[PDB]
Design an enzyme around this catalytic site. Sequence first.
Site, mmCIF file in Angstrom:
data_model
loop_
_atom_site.group_PDB
_atom_site.id
_atom_site.type_symbol
_atom_site.label_atom_id
_atom_site.label_comp_id
_atom_site.label_asym_id
_atom_site.label_seq_id
_atom_site.Cartn_x
_atom_site.Cartn_y
_atom_site.Cartn_z
ATOM 1 N N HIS A 40 0.818 -1.208 0.000
ATOM 2 C CA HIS A 40 0.000 0.000 0.000
ATOM 3 C C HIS A 40 0.859 1.268 0.000
ATOM 4 O O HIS A 40 0.311 2.360 -0.201
ATOM 5 C CB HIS A 40 -1.070 -0.041 1.104
ATOM 6 C CG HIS A 40 -0.624 0.421 2.445
ATOM 7 N ND1 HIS A 40 -0.315 -0.421 3.495
ATOM 8 C CD2 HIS A 40 -0.533 1.683 2.922
ATOM 9 C CE1 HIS A 40 -0.078 0.327 4.562
ATOM 10 N NE2 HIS A 40 -0.181 1.603 4.232
ATOM 11 N N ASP A 84 0.007 -7.577 1.774
ATOM 12 C CA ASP A 84 0.476 -6.188 1.784
ATOM 13 C C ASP A 84 2.009 -6.151 1.895
ATOM 14 O O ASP A 84 2.595 -5.859 2.947
ATOM 15 C CB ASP A 84 -0.188 -5.394 2.903
ATOM 16 C CG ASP A 84 0.054 -3.883 2.793
ATOM 17 O OD1 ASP A 84 0.541 -3.438 1.736
ATOM 18 O OD2 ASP A 84 -0.286 -3.170 3.779
ATOM 19 N N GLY A 175 2.179 6.757 8.629
ATOM 20 C CA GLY A 175 3.548 7.141 8.361
ATOM 21 C C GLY A 175 4.592 6.104 8.757
ATOM 22 O O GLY A 175 5.747 6.194 8.323
ATOM 23 N N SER A 177 3.825 2.892 8.089
ATOM 24 C CA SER A 177 3.501 1.833 7.150
ATOM 25 C C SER A 177 4.723 1.463 6.318
ATOM 26 O O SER A 177 5.485 2.310 5.873
ATOM 27 C CB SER A 177 2.384 2.251 6.208
ATOM 28 O OG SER A 177 1.154 2.279 6.900
ATOM 29 N N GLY A 178 4.845 0.150 6.093
ATOM 30 C CA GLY A 178 5.944 -0.388 5.326
ATOM 31 C C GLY A 178 7.182 -0.706 6.150
ATOM 32 O O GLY A 178 8.071 -1.414 5.655
#
Length: 223
Positions: A40, A84, A175, A177-178
């Site tokens: 995402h 994801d 923020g 994320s990942g």
Amino acid sequence: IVGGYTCGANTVPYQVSLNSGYHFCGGSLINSQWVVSAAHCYKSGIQVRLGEDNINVVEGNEQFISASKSIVHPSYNSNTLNNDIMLIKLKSAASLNSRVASISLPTSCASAGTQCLISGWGNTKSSGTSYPDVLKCLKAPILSDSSCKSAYPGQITSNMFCAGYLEGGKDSCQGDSGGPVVCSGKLQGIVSWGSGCAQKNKPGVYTKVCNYVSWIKQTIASN
Ligand SMILES: [Ca+2]
């Protein structure tokens, strides 16, 4: 990261910032030329920033390297966030050192109760907004599948796990994320989703990296 602590400069040497004119997601360096992040987080125009602490000040340990390729998981579903995960190849290899280092992929999946380190430059507030300049950290346990499903009926797949605190107050956030979830020195999770941040009975949900090691390795081997 809500309810965490300041990591310390370059103490999380596999943490990268994905930049498209500004920080927008985390990622994890898994060898000198590849980063793992969340699907995402996909966009064009990614510059990978390694060796960062303060993302707004050049402090002397950074390496800024453009992406040459992005590969979103074949089966990523942006509605459910199943699968994801994405891979990002760097245009040139990073120079590995004590401050910029890859993180091991897991040999085995981690169990509920294992303590992990979650990190990022995301929001530090569960109500309102404050985005830090320096890297934040949170130690958090993996939660049981049962309690993850009970928190999020109809939403947790075999490619997800929950981690954090059902009482609220400590979580990853927008923020982050990942970015990484590292447990006993292995990358077990990727910051993926959750309802709000740090809310009671709404723990963080993370991509279950151990399910993807074969795909990661064979993708790297041919790209
Ligand atoms: Ca910096």
